[PDB]
Design a binder for this molecule. Structure first.
Ligand SMILES: Nc1nc2c(ncn2[C@@H]2O[C@H](COP(=O)(O)OP(=O)(O)OP(=O)(O)O)[C@@H](O)[C@H]2O)c(=O)[nH]1
Ligand SMILES: Nc1ncnc2c1ncn2[C@@H]1O[C@H](COP(=O)(O)OP(=O)(O)CP(=O)(O)O)[C@@H](O)[C@H]1O
Ligand SMILES: CCOC(=O)c1cc2c(n1Cc1cc(OC)cc(OC)c1)-c1oncc1CCC2
Ligand SMILES: Nc1nc2c(ncn2[C@@H]2O[C@H](COP(=O)(O)OP(=O)(O)O)[C@@H](O)[C@H]2O)c(=O)[nH]1
Ligand SMILES: [Ca+2]
Ligand SMILES: [Ca+2]
Ligand SMILES: [Ca+2]
Ligand SMILES: [Mg+2]
Ligand SMILES: [Mg+2]
Lengths: 426, 437, 309, 54
């Protein structure tokens, strides 16, 4: 009865969050009203991990929707599965955060965090055995970035012995709202380095490239990007939601994927990424090759530029589990130079019989690679380009921050980059 | 008649225990509801099967077992399985949160909260024993509970039952069969803390059971069910001398006497034959000579290693089925003049033989075919140290970088326990080398 | 693409074997400590046989037979020859030897006194695995203060013109199936004292012109008989037939020939070098019969297959 | 090749064949190491809370 508490904050957090509940609700056979209508036992066996059961065989997502402006949350309530969420779990202000980390973390957000913690406390108090929390948010805005990390800090203080997991969307000039995104992302990464156990790095630069180069989408929209994120979030949580030879939880994942506390930022991967060919069935060899190909990575880092510390691969669908072990062992024994030698057997494989909607089989990749440093270098460079001239700082000093907190944020991330570089040459 | 209490810890120990007691019932004619029609002494008796089964006034034969797991999902299968009527609730102990593959979490953090409850339930069963011999502990090396809580239980058992023997059935970690990356850490942590508390331990490398299932049973991707049924047969042939009339290894003390002259070197190698596929209707029954010869084939050993490059300290042969002492000696005489069987100078070159006329019992619908004669060899060969060397090498690779160490230090363990445990293993490897080289 | 590792840089044989593997485009060399290898060219001392054959999904092969040291160590070879029922019986091709710990001290002097008594050739050579040749038993036992004392071939076959003593080196390869392959090319090391390397072709020509016989008939038959006896003796102790890993190994047999055209086994080398002129042919043959037989790639044999049951 | 200690019964038979002759910590000490580990846990958590308070 290991329950997970889901939290989605800000525009991006609530848009990928809503899509996540639509996807997995369909897989578990739950309709927009909360009534089950599946046809398999595997759908309900571990349904308690993400859903609460209300009277009348109704299933209510254990989700808490948070934002400093009502705009996006009103869309969720009007969306397809809007009526499935607990109405009391909508916590929102009216001022917004203006794409300002300081407003979400120090001023506007501080005024709303307590009421969020009240809902979180009500959900946890009715948990048989709370695993921890998973948060969806972007790092480039104000609410998800600033207030999101404020929530993480306060959740940890009240539940120091629970796992904190996040799906964090990294900003990219290729898909940009404002110029201060590097400032907000640099400030958040330090919070994440300190107060999370597992962070799925979802890079908007990679999502755009996958839509443009692979899926052949000339003008990707946020909807297109969120389609990939939904597919990934369904993938990395399959072994938490369904039963099988490997019934995983958030803590065993952290134990096997995080050899050092600060290095807990994962590269997610998904296959197939077919462009609308959606009828052509993939073979286990093809899933394995694409799954490890950088073109299927959601972080925009070249894995061959670093080394894998640990890897988790999940195969969904009815396939030859024998041929799965053969292809996995083939990838490792062929490119054994990209897997560190001081962690034996660092590639683990799991199989789930139920494939995602619209696919005969899929493969999800969770890699803890030192090549993730390229992402933090990218952010650090964009950060420094402006900070060297103190550009746009007035948006932040006007909310009580001083330049020192920025100097420390950059230093902390450069350290993070150096730590990854240390183990890439071990 | 002296009783033996079995203790199953963690998923591996519980599921392996569930397979053994299913087999015990079939071998003793005990139905799932605990009734035993062939038992004419209703509600009591001092028979040989009473070493493992107590009796109620209603004629139910209750295993002298206790299942312990830090999470409830695996032991809930027992509460619902075919043999749910066998055990009573007090025997089944479960927690809320498992050890997350972390020895420190099962030994210190979580174990400290449940150790007393387990010891109490054990005292309940001990209070039904006129002459308790000791305990049989089933557990995995790599699991957080199987490794962390077992070593804690073993220490407390040495305190509360100082004069009793303790035997282990341990599952050695194999990457091919679902394994965490830190299982080498846990294996070495629990071996160090349990070493001076176990009188005799039978290691079973999942790598061995896996390949035996793939090559002899023609199973492409063996499951735990496949592995456990094979392991239960082997465990059965080892514990048979305790459950049936006989004169060889009739009490836990004899295992130490016949298989372990050096207390630290108490890990006998087990070899089992024949393993015939059930899907094979036309099975050419193997002879006494052919099955006894197979006992010296590494492909039939519970741990893959080369006894040819070691030294035997003791050897026991446990036959079940149509075996007569004459055929066994004619087979030994032939295998001596062909195989490489070197004993240490301070030990006689011989074999203690035990024969049970009841051929092996196979679970109906299983993967193993019924045979007319099987044999399990228990040899204390220094070659089993190869398994310690493999394990200690993987330990050294990760610990040189301190990988994952923070998860253990974060539960109250100190980094020094790692080094202490590894040093004890270094001494263990040296003891084997000084005995067989 | 097959993977292999190199753990003995000082091996001139397998340094060339590794060079050929890369030249096929189908083999990739890894770091010496990478365990995901299909082939290990291991080190001479403390090769970790116990860690071989446990990598799932990898057929592993190593270029040494665990336990072959019994045949390649001088004190062990003598013990093996004296205590093996399949050998001790005959041994008309192995010199009278004794293992003397610094024990068969009394047995050596028993045969020694019998020689000086009868005024026979009583010259013995003592070495280990620094050498001393003497006819006085006192000088031998004091030189060693584990060694072996062996009869010195007082009547060796001497090549003419030159009055030169020589020894024959034969390279034998045993594969994972325990086929025994004798390289067609050998080498004789001439003393040059009453360029010190004579190959079989010349030696065969000399034997015909000088003694009116062939190398095959007068010497090679005994060489093949000796090679087969030694290797079939330890086969049950080192065979990797039903083992979780596989073994092959190149051996170096050293023979002496007396003036009666009788062959004597001197020693067996487990890590031998090769003749500079024959490195290429033999190394390519190692890849053919020992490596590619287990890992095939994408016609007269240079080896003589010594048949055995 | 000698056969000794031959015992027979209805269930089976056992014997020995010889080929060649030859040539704890107390409860208190455990409770202290357990409680010691719990102190280090509580100390590491206090430092975390002290850090969060700052
Ligand atoms: N042969 C066999 N091995 C098993 C079985 N179950 C688990 N294992 C092995 O045991 C090791 C993991 O130990 P577990 O028993 O699953 O873990 P645990 O004792 O429950 O401890 P935690 O789950 O961490 O609390 C892995 O190496 C598995 O391969 C089983 O049923 N049969
Ligand atoms: N019993 C014996 N009778 C005569 N000469 C002998 C002999 N034993 C050894 N020798 C001489 O010594 C040589 C072999 O001795 P030894 O084994 O010490 O050589 P070695 O192993 O040190 C180097 P290599 O491996 O090249 O032979 C023979 O070639 C021969 O010249
Ligand atoms: C080398 C690191 O490998 C991992 O991550 C890894 C290895 C293992 C696990 N885990 C986590 C995991 C979680 C998951 O679902 C979120 C899907 C996975 O696919 C293989 C693996 C795991 O989990 N639950 C129980 C276990 C048992 C130990 C093996
Ligand atoms: N992938 C994805 N990214 C988004 C979405 N909406 C906003 N973003 C990204 O998030 C950042 C803006 O943060 P936002 O969530 O709108 O700010 P907030 O509402 O104050 O937390 C920019 O980097 C955007 O590219 C979305 O629906 N999908
Ligand atoms: Ca206000
Ligand atoms: Ca009775
Ligand atoms: Ca004791
Ligand atoms: Mg926005
Ligand atoms: Mg468990």
């Amino acid at each position: 009865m290991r329950e997970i508490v889901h939290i989605q904050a800000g525009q991006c957090g609530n848009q990928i969050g809503a899509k996540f509940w639509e996807v997995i609700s369909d897989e578990h056979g739950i309709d927009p009203t909360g009534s089950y209508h599946g046809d398999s036992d595997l759908q309900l066996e571990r349904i308690n991990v993400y859903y609460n059961e209300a009277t009348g065989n109704k299933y209510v997502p254990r989700a808490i929707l948070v934002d400093l402006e009502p705009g996006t949350m009103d869309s969720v309530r009007s969306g397809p599965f809007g009526q499935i969420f607990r109405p009391d779990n909508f916590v929102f202000g009216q001022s917004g955060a203006g794409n300002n980390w300081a407003k979400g973390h120090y001023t506007e957000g501080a005024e709303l965090v307590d009421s969020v913690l009240d809902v979180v406390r009500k959900e946890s108090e009715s948990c048989d055995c709370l695993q921890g929390f998973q948060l969806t948010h972007s790092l480039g805005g104000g609410t998800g970035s600033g207030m999101g990390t404020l929530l993480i800090s306060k959740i940890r203080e009240e539940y120091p012995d629970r796992i904190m997991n996040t799906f964090s969307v990294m900003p990219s000039p290729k898909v940009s709202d404002t110029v201060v995104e590097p400032y907000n992302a640099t400030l958040s990464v330090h919070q994440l380095v300190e107060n999370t156990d597992e962070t799925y790095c979802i890079d908007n630069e990679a999502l755009y490239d996958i839509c443009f180069r692979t899926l052949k989408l000339t003008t990707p929209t946020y909807g297109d990007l969120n389609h990939l994120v939904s597919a990934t979030m369904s993938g990395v949580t399959t072994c938490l939601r369904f039963p099988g030879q490997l019934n995983a939880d958030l803590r065993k994942l952290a134990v096997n994927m995080v050899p050092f506390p600060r290095l807990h930022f994962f590269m997610p991967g998904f296959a197939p990424l077919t462009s609308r060919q959606q009828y052509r069935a993939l073979t286990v060899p093809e899933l394995t090759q694409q799954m490890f190909d950088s073109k299927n990575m959601m972080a925009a880092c070249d894995p061959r530029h670093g080394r894998y510390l640990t890897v988790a691969a999940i195969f969904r669908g009815r396939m030859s589990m024998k041929e799965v072990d053969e292809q996995m062992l083939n990838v490792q024994n062929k490119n054994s130079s990209y897997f560190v030698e001081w962690i034996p057997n660092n590639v683990k494989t799991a199989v789930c019989d139920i494939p995602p909607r619209g696919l005969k089989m899929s493969a999800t990749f969770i890699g803890n690679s030192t090549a993730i440093q390229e992402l933090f270098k990218r952010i650090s460079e964009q950060f420094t380009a402006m900070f060297r001239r103190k550009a746009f700082l007035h948006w932040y000093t006007g909310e009580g921050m001083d330049e020192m907190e920025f100097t420390e944020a950059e230093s902390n991330m450069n350290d993070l980059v150096s730590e990854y570089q240390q183990y890439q040459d071990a | 008649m002296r009783e033996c209490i079995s203790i199953h810890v963690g998923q591996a120990g519980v599921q392996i225990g569930n397979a053994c007691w299913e087999l015990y019932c079939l071998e003793h004619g005990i139905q799932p509801d605990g009734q035993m029609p062939s038992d004419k002494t209703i509600g009591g008796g001092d028979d040989s099967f009473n070493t493992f089964f107590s009796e109620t006034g209603a004629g139910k034969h209750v295993p002298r077992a206790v299942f312990v797991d830090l999470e409830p999902t695996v032991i809930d299968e027992v509460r619902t399985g075919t043999y749910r009527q066998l055990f009573h609730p007090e025997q089944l102990i479960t927690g809320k949160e498992d050890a997350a593959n972390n020895y420190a979490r099962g030994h210190y953090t979580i174990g400290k909260e449940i150790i007393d409850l387990v010891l109490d339930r054990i005292r309940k069963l001990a209070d039904q024993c006129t002459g308790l011999q000791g305990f049989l502990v089933f557990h995995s090396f790599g699991g957080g509970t199987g490794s962390g809580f077992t070593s804690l239980l073993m220490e407390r058992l040495s305190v509360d039952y100082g004069k009793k023997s303790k035997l282990e059935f341990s599952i050695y970690p194999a990457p091919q069969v679902s394994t965490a990356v830190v299982e080498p850490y846990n294996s070495i942590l629990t071996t160090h803390t349990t070493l001076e508390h176990s009188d005799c331990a039978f290691m079973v490398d999942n790598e061995a059971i896996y390949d035996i299932c793939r090559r002899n049973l023609d199973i492409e991707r063996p499951t735990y069910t496949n592995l456990n049924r094979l392991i239960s047969q082997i465990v059965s042939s080892i514990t048979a001398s305790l459950r049936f009339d006989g004169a060889l290894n009739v009490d836990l003390t004899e295992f130490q006497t016949n298989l372990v002259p050096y207390p630290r070197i108490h890990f006998p190698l087990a070899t089992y034959a024949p393993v015939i596929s059930a899907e094979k209707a036309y099975h050419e029954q193997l002879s006494v000579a052919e099955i006894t010869n197979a006992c010296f084939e590494p492909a039939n050993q519970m741990v893959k290693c080369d006894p040819r490059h070691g030294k035997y300290m003791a050897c026991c042969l446990l036959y079940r089925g149509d075996v007569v002492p004459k055929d066994v000696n004619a087979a030994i005489a032939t295998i001596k003049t062909k195989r490489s069987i070197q004993f240490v100078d301070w030990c006689p070159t011989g074999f203690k033989v035990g024969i049970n006329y009841q051929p092996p019992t196979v679970v109906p619908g299983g993967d193993l075919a019924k045979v007319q004669r099987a044999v399990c060899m228990l040899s204390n060969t220094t070659a089993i140290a190869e398994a310690w060397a493999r394990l200690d090498h993987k330990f050294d690779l990760m610990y040189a970088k301190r990988a994952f160490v923070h998860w253990y230090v974060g539960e109250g363990m100190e980094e020094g326990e790692f080094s202490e445990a590894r040093e004890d293993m270094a001494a263990l490897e040296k003891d084997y080398e000084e005995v067989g080289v | 693409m097959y993977t292999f590792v190199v753990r003995d840089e000082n091996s001139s044989v397998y340094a060339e074997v590794s060079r050929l593997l890369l030249a096929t485009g189908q083999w990739k060399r890894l770091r010496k400590d990478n365990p995901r290898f299909n082939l290990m060219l291991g080190e001479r001392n403390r090769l970790p046989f116990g860690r071989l054959g446990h990598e799932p999904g990898l057929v592993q092969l190593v270029n040494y037979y665990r336990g072959a040291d019994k045949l390649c160590r001088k004190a062990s070879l003598v013990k093996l020859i004296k205590t093996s029922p399949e050998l001790s019986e005959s041994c008309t091709w192995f010199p009278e030897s004794y293992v003397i710990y610094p024990d068969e001290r009394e047995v050596f002097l028993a045969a020694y006194n019998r020689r000086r008594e009868g005024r026979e050739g009583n010259v013995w050579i003592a070495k280990s695995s620094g050498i001393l040749i003497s006819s006085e038993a006192s000088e031998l036992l004091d030189f060693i203060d584990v060694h072996v004392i062996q009869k010195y071939l007082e009547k060796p076959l001497l090549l003419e013109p030159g009055h030169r003593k020589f020894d024959i080196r034969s390279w034998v390869l045993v594969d994972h199936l325990y086929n025994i392959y004798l390289y067609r090319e050998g080498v004789l090391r001439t003393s040059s004292e009453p360029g010190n390397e004579m190959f079989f072709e010349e030696f065969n020509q000399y034997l015909m012109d000088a003694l009116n016989t062939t190398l095959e008939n007068s010497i090679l038959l005994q060489i093949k008989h000796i090679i087969r006896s030694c290797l079939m003796c330890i086969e049950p102790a080192i065979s990797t037939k039903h083992l979780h890993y596989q073994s092959f190994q190149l051996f170096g047999f050293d023979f002496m020939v007396d003036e009666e055209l009788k062959v004597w086994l001197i020693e067996v080398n487990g890590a031998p070098a090769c003749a500079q002129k024959l490195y290429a042919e033999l190394c390519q043959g190692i890849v053919d019969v020992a490596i590619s037989s287990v890992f095939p790639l994408a016609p007269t044999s240079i080896f003589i297959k010594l048949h055995h049951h | 090749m000698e056969v000794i200690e031959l015992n027979k019964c209805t269930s089976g038979q056992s014997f020995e064949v010889i080929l060649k002759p030859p040539s704890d910590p107390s409860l208190e000490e455990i409770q202290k190491k357990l409680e010691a580990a719990e102190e280090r846990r509580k100390y590491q958590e206090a430092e975390l809370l002290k850090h969060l308070a700052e």
